[PDB]
């Protein structure tokens, strides 16, 4: 009839959060430098986990989700770290003087 | 039912009283657990004890569990009018379903007396029409919870048409009951009043109606 | 937390059949047995069976193994923590000693020495067995420290039960129903009487409505 | 008068596309830490 | 019986409470500036500083070796009133923690100041002698 | 009774000696390249960097899961010659840690040795049977 506390230390007990996710693509070998598989993102595992929830029910909203915006943020800047290397077109703002074909 | 209990026990406000619950061995005891459950007639039950002596959630601890080896028993302490009514008890394992008690019904004493409520109600013009007539005689706010019910036709009794009702807790845990006399029209007209005696052990009360008025 | 309601009364023949139904809310329909106990004058209580609506595992007692059937719906999720379902017991080949109360009930635990104990119970479902048809009841006025009361008679009706308001609800302070009477005939018949202060004749009025569904009758009475 | 309902195309905004393929995805932190109450005490020894 | 990382969220917890040696497993465990260095570097010091934080209190707790440990500390019944087999037979983890996030930082305290700070000092003076 | 974070820093040993769990608390806790960032991200490993060095000596030490612990090591009288009313008593950790600063190095490693890599062996030669 004397209750104690006592700690547990690995209860299934999780809250909604956002963190900050990482790219992993599986291993395609070949030209290259495609923008988004960069040169190096985390070969995904031989062998993907799945373990199904018995019992589970969480609530979801695909429109409040962080993980689109930060999907949008990642090809964005994706997108930018691919062009800087490249060519810049500055000189070829002449005036064009152009004719049918 | 193989389970029997105590078919009616008594205790005294504000003390304590115990209902046994036993029967054979198949059904008794070891290798079994039991339950016990609170049952006003009409109303949905409520569960008190599971296990042996572990208490519902919510249950006060008034309300305590033991279980010897032949009988299991409840004890109620500290007694309240809403505590007489009826309680039954329940054998069970975890893979077998419930097997219901014979029933206790429990009364306490050392409770006020309560002085008997009597209205008494004359036909209706539609319904001398139908053409019948119905006396209804309604009782309630009465304790102990027991009643007798008496007709008469112009002073002297009436056997023909009576019909009562058993006597019926009130939510206030009084008690109530209704008395019906069905009569004719002519039997209605024909006499100088009716009357409806209600009889208590303490007080004996009377109402009446006439047909003049 | 979770209220469990129940279909309401039905009359039926002998050797006709009959579905009960219980819908669950404000508990995980999926984490709890749900029981059927019925109640009659001749043998008492009397446990019937329990099913579980995650496994669909099912316990009927030998009395009712041959005459019982129980199944289960799919719950409707509302929270994480709750949702809302429903449960059926399908009983044919009715006898008259079958008539009496029918209850559904949640269990108790999740897990355990006792998970199916009925602990939650519903309001009940009246079932008459009777070869009687159904007869719907007449409704009679009741004429009236300066306090009086008033009613309504509700006499001759069968099967059980009636149910009486007043004022379309908004009324239900002083209100007394006393149970029904059991005539030689086989027809029930009640009484209804609400208690009101005498002077209260200038400003309130007083409707009972009584409403006998086995009939499929209602009644708004003036008195 | 909700007698009749045109429907269009757009491309109002990019993020639409990865939502088409993140609606069942969700993020969340596992908290191991779970303090309960039992008959246990521990020993003064 | 095992049903995988976090496979019991949803059972009772008498039942999760034998396979937290699951979710202690998988608790854990020429410019390289690209967006996903950047970020995966970051996740990685993102998920030893999470576990150092929960090994901390479980440190200052005295509790450091074990996933199940006693203490000295009373259960309070301002915090909640059920019985054992409705605590551990009737409901899940997450449900408990949301009925007892409330009082989560008071229990927290006296768990640390109750017992490891009063029983250190405790340990010195019975083993003086 | 807590003052906070160091409060009992100009303490007498003994008075100190009594709120180590303060300590112990807060003792550890388009492109993100910002100058802020880099330092940020820098000091997060520092941090966990100099605690888990410090838990690394408890550990060697078998003193691991304790504020408190007892050793073998007897107190050579060559660092301090100090009686205990004198050293804990009059004297705050700051000038006992100057004061033994001298010796720390040879201290810590008779503590490392002198105890758990003897105790280890003989624990097993003892629960050996
Ligand atoms: C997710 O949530 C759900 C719901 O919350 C949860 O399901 C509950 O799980 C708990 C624990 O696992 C269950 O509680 C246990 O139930 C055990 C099963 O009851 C037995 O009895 C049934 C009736 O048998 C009679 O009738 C048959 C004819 O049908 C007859 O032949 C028999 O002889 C007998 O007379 C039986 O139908 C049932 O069978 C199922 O289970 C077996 C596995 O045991 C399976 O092989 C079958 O195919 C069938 O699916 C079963 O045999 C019961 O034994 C148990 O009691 C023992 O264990 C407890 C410890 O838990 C001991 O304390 C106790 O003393 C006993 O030794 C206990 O009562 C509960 O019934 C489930 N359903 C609910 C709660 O609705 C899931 O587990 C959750 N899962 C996760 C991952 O979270
Ligand atoms: C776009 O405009 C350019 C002009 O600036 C066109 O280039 C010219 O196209 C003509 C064809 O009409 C070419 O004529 C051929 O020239 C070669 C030279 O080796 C000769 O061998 C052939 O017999 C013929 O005369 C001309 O050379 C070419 N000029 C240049 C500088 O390349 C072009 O064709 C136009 N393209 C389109 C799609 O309109
Ligand atoms: C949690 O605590 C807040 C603040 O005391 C209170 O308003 C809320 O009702 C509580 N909810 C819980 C613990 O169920
Ligand atoms: C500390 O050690 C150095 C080198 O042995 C010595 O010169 C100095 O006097 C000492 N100071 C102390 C410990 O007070």
């Known amino acids: 009839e004397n209750l104690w506390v006592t700690v547990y230390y690995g209860v299934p007990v999780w809250k909604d959060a956002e963190t900050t996710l990482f790219c992993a693509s599986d291993a395609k070998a070949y030209k290259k430098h495609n923008v988004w598989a960069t040169h190096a993102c985390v070969p995904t595992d031989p062998n993907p986990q799945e373990i199904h929830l018995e019992n589970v029910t969480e609530e979801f909203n695909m429109w409040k989700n962080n993980m689109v915006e930060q999907m949008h943020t990642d090809i964005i800047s994706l997108w930018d770290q691919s062009l800087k290397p490249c060519v810049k077109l500055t000189p070829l703002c002449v005036t064009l003087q152009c004719t049918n074909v | 039912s193989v389970l029997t209990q105590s078919a009616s026990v008594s205790g005294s406000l504000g003390q304590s009283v115990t209902i046994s619950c036993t029967g054979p061995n198949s059904v008794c005891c070891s290798h079994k657990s039991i339950s016990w459950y609170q049952w006003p007639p009409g109303r949905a039950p409520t569960l008190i004890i599971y296990e042996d002596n572990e208490r519902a959630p919510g249950i006060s601890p008034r309300f305590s569990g033991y279980k010897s080896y032949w009988s299991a028993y409840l004890t109620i302490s500290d007694l309240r009018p809403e505590d007489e009514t009826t309680y039954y008890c329940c054998s069970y394992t975890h893979n077998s379903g419930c097997v219901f008690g014979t029933g206790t019904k429990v009364s306490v004493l050392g409770q006020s007396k309560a002085n008997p409520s009597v209205t008494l109600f004359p036909p209706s013009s539609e319904e001398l029409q139908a053409n019948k007539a119905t006396l209804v005689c309604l009782i309630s706010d009465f304790y102990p919870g027991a009643v007798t019910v008496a007709w008469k036709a112009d002073s002297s009794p009436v056997k023909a048409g009576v019909e009562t009702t058993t006597p019926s807790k009130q939510s206030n845990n009084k008690y109530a009951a209704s008395s019906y006399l069905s009569l004719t029209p002519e039997q209605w007209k024909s006499h100088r009043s009716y009357s409806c005696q209600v009889t208590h052990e303490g007080s004996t009360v009377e109402k009446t109606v006439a047909p003049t008025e | 937390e979770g209220q469990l309601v129940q279909s309401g009364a039905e009359l039926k023949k002998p050797g006709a059949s009959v579905k009960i139904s219980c819908k669950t809310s404000?508990?995980?329909?999926?984490?709890?047995?749900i029981n059927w106990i019925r109640q009659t004058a001749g043998r008492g209580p009397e446990w019937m069976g329990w099913?579980?609506?995650?496994?669909?595992?099912?316990?009927?007692?030998?009395?009712?193994?041959?005459r019982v059937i129980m199944t289960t719906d799919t719950e409707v999720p509302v929270t994480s923590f709750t949702s809302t379902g429903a449960a059926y017991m399908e009983i044919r080949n009715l006898k008259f000693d079958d008539t009496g109360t029918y209850f559904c009930?949640?269990?108790?635990?999740?897990?355990?020495?006792?998970?199916?104990?009925?602990?939650?119970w519903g309001q009940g479902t009246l079932l008459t067995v009777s070869s009687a048809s159904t007869k719907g009841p007449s409704v009679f006025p009741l004429a009236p420290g300066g306090t009086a009361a008033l009613g309504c008679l509700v006499k001759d009706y069968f099967p059980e039960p009636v149910t009486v308001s007043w004022n379309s609800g908004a009324l239900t302070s002083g209100v007394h129903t006393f149970p029904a009477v059991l005539q030689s005939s086989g027809l029930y018949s009640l009484s209804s009487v609400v208690t009101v202060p005498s002077s209260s004749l200038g400003t309130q009025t007083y409707i009972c409505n009584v409403n006998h569904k086995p009939s499929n009758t209602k009644v708004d009475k003036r008195v | 008068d909700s007698t009749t309902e045109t429907f269009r195309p757009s491309g109002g905004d990019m993020r639409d596309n990865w939502r088409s393929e993140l609606y069942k995805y969700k993020v969340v932190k596992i908290e191991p830490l779970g303090v309960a109450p039992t008959r246990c005490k521990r020993r003064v020894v | 019986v095992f049903l995988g990382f976090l496979g019991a969220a949803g059972s009772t917890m008498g039942a999760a409470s034998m396979t937290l040696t699951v979710q202690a497993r998988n608790l854990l465990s020429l410019l390289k500036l690209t967006v996903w260095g950047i970020k995966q570097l970051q996740a990685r010091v993102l998920a030893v500083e999470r576990y150092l934080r929960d090994q901390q209190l479980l440190g200052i707790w005295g509790c450091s070796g074990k996933l199940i440990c006693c203490t000295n500390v009373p259960w309070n019944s301002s915090w909640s009133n059920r019985n054992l087999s409705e605590i551990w037979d009737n409901m899940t983890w997450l449900q408990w923690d949301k009925e007892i996030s409330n009082y989560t930082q008071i229990i927290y305290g006296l768990l640390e100041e109750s017992q490891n700070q009063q029983e250190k000092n405790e340990q010195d003076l019975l083993a003086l002698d | 009774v807590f003052l906070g974070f160091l409060g009992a820093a100009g303490s007498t040993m003994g008075a100190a000696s009594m709120t180590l769990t303060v300590q112990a608390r807060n003792l550890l806790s388009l492109l993100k390249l910002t100058v802020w960032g880099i330092k940020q991200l820098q000091a997060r490993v520092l941090a966990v960097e100099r605690y888990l060095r410090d838990q690394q000596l408890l550990g060697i030490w078998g003193c691991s899961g304790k504020l408190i612990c007892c050793t073998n090591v007897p107190w050579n009288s060559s660092w301090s010659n100090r009686n205990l009313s004198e050293i804990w008593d009059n004297m705050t950790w700051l000038q006992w840690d100057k004061e033994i600063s001298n010796y720390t190095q040879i201290i810590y490693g008779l503590l490392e040795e002198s105890q758990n890599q003897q105790e280890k062996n003989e624990q097993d030669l003892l629960a050996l049977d």
């Open positions: 009930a949640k269990g108790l635990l999740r897990d355990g020495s006792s998970t199916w104990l009925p602990y939650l």
């Open positions: 404000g508990y995980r329909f999926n984490f709890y047995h």
């Open positions: 099913i579980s609506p995650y496994s669909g595992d099912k316990n009927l007692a030998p009395a009712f193994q041959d």
